[PDB]
Design a protein around this motif. Sequence first.
Motif, PDB file in Angstrom:
ATOM      1  N   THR A   1       1.948   2.998   3.469  1.00 56.85           N
ATOM      2  CA  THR A   1       1.130   4.113   2.982  1.00 56.85           C
ATOM      3  C   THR A   1       1.987   5.205   2.341  1.00 56.85           C
ATOM      4  OG1 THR A   1      -0.982   5.263   3.322  1.00 56.85           O
ATOM      5  CG2 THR A   1       0.736   5.783   4.906  1.00 56.85           C
TER       6      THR A   1
ATOM      7  N   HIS B   1      -5.051  -1.117   6.316  1.00 52.55           N
ATOM      8  CA  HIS B   1      -5.216  -0.706   7.725  1.00 52.55           C
ATOM      9  C   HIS B   1      -5.969  -1.712   8.598  1.00 52.55           C
ATOM     10  CE1 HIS B   1      -3.565   3.349   6.979  1.00 52.55           C
ATOM     11  NE2 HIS B   1      -4.296   3.344   5.879  1.00 52.55           N
TER      12      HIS B   1
ATOM     13  N   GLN C   1      -1.748   3.262  -4.879  1.00 50.39           N
ATOM     14  CA  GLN C   1      -3.154   3.617  -5.017  1.00 50.39           C
ATOM     15  C   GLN C   1      -3.249   5.121  -5.261  1.00 50.39           C
ATOM     16  OE1 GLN C   1      -5.658   3.385  -1.505  1.00 50.39           O
ATOM     17  NE2 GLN C   1      -7.401   2.602  -2.694  1.00 50.39           N
TER      18      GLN C   1
ATOM     19  N   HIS D   1      -9.387   1.084   1.404  1.00 49.67           N
ATOM     20  CA  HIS D   1      -9.138   1.325   2.828  1.00 49.67           C
ATOM     21  C   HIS D   1     -10.224   0.651   3.671  1.00 49.67           C
ATOM     22  CE1 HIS D   1      -6.886   4.788   1.027  1.00 49.67           C
ATOM     23  NE2 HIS D   1      -6.003   4.378   1.917  1.00 49.67           N
TER      24      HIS D   1
ATOM     25  N   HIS E   1       0.986   5.564  -1.639  1.00 47.33           N
ATOM     26  CA  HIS E   1       0.415   6.694  -2.377  1.00 47.33           C
ATOM     27  C   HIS E   1       1.618   7.512  -2.833  1.00 47.33           C
ATOM     28  CE1 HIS E   1      -3.415   5.515  -0.812  1.00 47.33           C
ATOM     29  NE2 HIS E   1      -3.127   5.871   0.428  1.00 47.33           N
TER      30      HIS E   1
ATOM     31  N   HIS F   1       0.818  -1.226   0.000  1.00 45.02           N
ATOM     32  CA  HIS F   1       0.000   0.000   0.000  1.00 45.02           C
ATOM     33  C   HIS F   1       0.849   1.273   0.000  1.00 45.02           C
ATOM     34  CE1 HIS F   1      -3.891   2.063   0.569  1.00 45.02           C
ATOM     35  NE2 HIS F   1      -3.283   2.842   1.446  1.00 45.02           N
TER      36      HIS F   1
HETATM   37 ZN   LIG Z   1      -3.998   4.751   1.932  1.00 47.92          ZN
END
Ligand SMILES: [Zn+2]
Lengths: 453, 453
Positions: A325, A274, A129, A238, A65, A63
């Motif tokens: 993340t 998460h 993502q 998420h 960004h 995961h």
């Molecule tokens: Zn995220």
Amino acid sequence: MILIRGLTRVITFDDQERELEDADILIDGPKIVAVGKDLSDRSVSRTIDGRGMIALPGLINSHQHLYEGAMRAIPQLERVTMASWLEGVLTRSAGWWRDGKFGPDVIREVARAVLLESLLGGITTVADQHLFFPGATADSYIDATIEAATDLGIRFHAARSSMTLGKSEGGFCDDLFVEPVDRVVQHCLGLIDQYHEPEPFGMVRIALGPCGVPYDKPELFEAFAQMAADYDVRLHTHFYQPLDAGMSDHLYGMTPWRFLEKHGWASDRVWLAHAVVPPREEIPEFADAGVAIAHLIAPDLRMGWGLAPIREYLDAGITVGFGTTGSASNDGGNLLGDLRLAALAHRPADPNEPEKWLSARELLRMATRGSAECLGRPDLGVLEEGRAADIACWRLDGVDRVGVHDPAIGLIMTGLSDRASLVVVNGQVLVENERPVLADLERIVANTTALIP
Amino acid sequence: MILIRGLTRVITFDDQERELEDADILIDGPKIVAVGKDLSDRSVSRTIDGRGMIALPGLINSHQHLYEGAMRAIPQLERVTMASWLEGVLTRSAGWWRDGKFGPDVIREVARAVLLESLLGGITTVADQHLFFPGATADSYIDATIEAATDLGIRFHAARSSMTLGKSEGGFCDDLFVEPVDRVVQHCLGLIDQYHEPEPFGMVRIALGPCGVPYDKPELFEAFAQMAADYDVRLHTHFYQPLDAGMSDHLYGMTPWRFLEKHGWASDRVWLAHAVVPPREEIPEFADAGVAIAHLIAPDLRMGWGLAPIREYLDAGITVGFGTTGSASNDGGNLLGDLRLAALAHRPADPNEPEKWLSARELLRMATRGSAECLGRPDLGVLEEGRAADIACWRLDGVDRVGVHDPAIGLIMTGLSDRASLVVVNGQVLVENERPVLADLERIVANTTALIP
Ligand SMILES: [Zn+2]
Ligand SMILES: CCNc1nc(NC(C)C)nc(OC)n1
Ligand SMILES: [Zn+2]
């Protein structure tokens, strides 16, 4: 063929959890041919000296960004709760974009830097993502991340994301970021057709990745459920961030999990980011449905959310992977480093039951085989014959690791640096001596730095 | 004189929390001559290019157990409570010692490695509390640690420790480590005589460091309180670890704090390790007494203990420093790395009040000026005219720090590596380009590794 010879420790994460001492890995093209002692150099054209290193399957960050690489260590975002944070990130990105400072060309270079950092951290596969698609059309942001990834040679999944539920109808987001459901769906079809590599050892894959229950229309979830079955791709979103349950209850009168079930997402096609605060009663349902979960310790702590019930997930047989993340809520891409955070931070939740605490090996597993399973990659995450030659090695002979008794525990519990020594992706050597072998490190830093708004 | 020119960022921690951009540090012998823009290269015999670096005061580790460097990443000690931990550590150390594998000669080289790692991590001063004194007569273990520190050029405080309350008389300490009070006092006077450098910029200092309220006689605390006054040295001990309060009540019918107050340790001469679980109502008393506290996030988490009330200490005006503790409960000596652990792990205790979360700057202050104050060193921990030339610099221009907006926050929240670029101690350059200037790293690694039991 490439032979890595005399590795001090090899951690396979194979079905028997084999580890090896003073052993070799033999590579042929994209795949591992053998892992064992004294391997034959019969058809070898390059031998690499593995003495003094521990080798693992390449780490897999399930995961990211990537575009948040441009948003690190912003003073106003240092100590903020989720609502202030999300507003701040969306406002800044919308602002920069409006000023012509945040188009696909900029995102390409931000992605190049974070993906190169990833390689240097021993990460061989990244799943990004990306939801940022301002304007009247879906611009080439995904194409840009894929271009960066392919230039570097890092393995890459792009989970196309969105915010399709406007604040006007219950969403916590401005209509600047809101795309019509059909635009998103149309775009995803094109991306699959253009980029998706479904074959074993495939280097680019597309996934379908709504931002989440509070952010996307039920219609999109259902469209994606159909698309995933038709095109055999995976589903990502998420899951149980605090406050999600209040929003789901207010909008729909059901929990986020019940929402996902209703709209086709209780399936083994799905991995969830998460999973901090599920109702305990739903955990066996996650298990039966075969969904996978990515543990993201750094943002969970950074936002004040706390500790996801990872032991409970493992007890239940749920697939658990690991991720970082984005760098606006981390703020690095250092997956190995984040494992130490999890190793220590989970402990005070069970002061008198240390058997419940996550072990170094459980964590390393999450970051390799677990993440591989999250991404639906049976060809990754394991050092064995037939799997992809994605390998990360660290030196064990630094002054900061003297006195270490167990190298795997040592990798998580000691050290001044998480920099990998040797990194191989798809049978290609990309890092040696803690330096990129093909990428121009200095130029990449210079070029990206020039583009940070 | 030495000029460090054009540092991208300088964090002074001076009385106005000044920071500087594109500025210089001028050094003469052991001291800082000036800090500011475009300093004259007058009598400068050497100019160091600081561009692309952030400079801070040298980090000061206010609580170490150097000998534990030999006890890293032991599988049986990975997930244990305090009781099992103490059992495992005391057994191994005594057992290695009985077998001739853990003499001062071994401790010298373990200390050499951990202290070299410390330098490489930007740590310029370490306070060690050596806890292993087998046999009625404490060998030259302290001398060994001082020898290693002086060879390396790292600034060093040695807190002479003890376990004067034996279980043979209601204590908890084996009789193997128990010395008569007068014997401890005498060894301490001998150490002060031989080693203590009370002058400004002194490179070796002696402190008096009982293991703790559960472990040492009241008479030792009182004798030490007397010595501290006689010789203007400082007092150090462990404070409010879980279970201490019960052990203290059981032996003396009062709290660990009440006990310290009774025996002369409620004074501004004292710094206290951990302070994890004090009764809230005693906190104002700590403030009034002027005791300092060293926050040790890593062992507090590793033991499952949880979060010391640091915000409360800062609120009360109590001096707060930082340390790593020993490598058997960390398991590294990476102080900078531990700051990130604190930055994140404190947050979930106050999910809805981010203003209470410790900031990057508060944490960096703890690791510099805070720790200097703990050690009673007004000559350290601040980059300003007249203070010691102890300086630690990190590069900001790596691919893993692209997109960072605030370099100080970035030091905590980003990076693959905590390795310092440039380290100066007492005006002597000891690390440059992430490499020891004087120390033979490869030889030190080889020699120490050979001696690990
Ligand atoms: Zn995220
Ligand atoms: C909005 C739901 N969650 C969420 N989203 C992001 N990032 C995007 C805005 C790119 N990061 C976090 O970090 C915790 N949470
Ligand atoms: Zn201690």
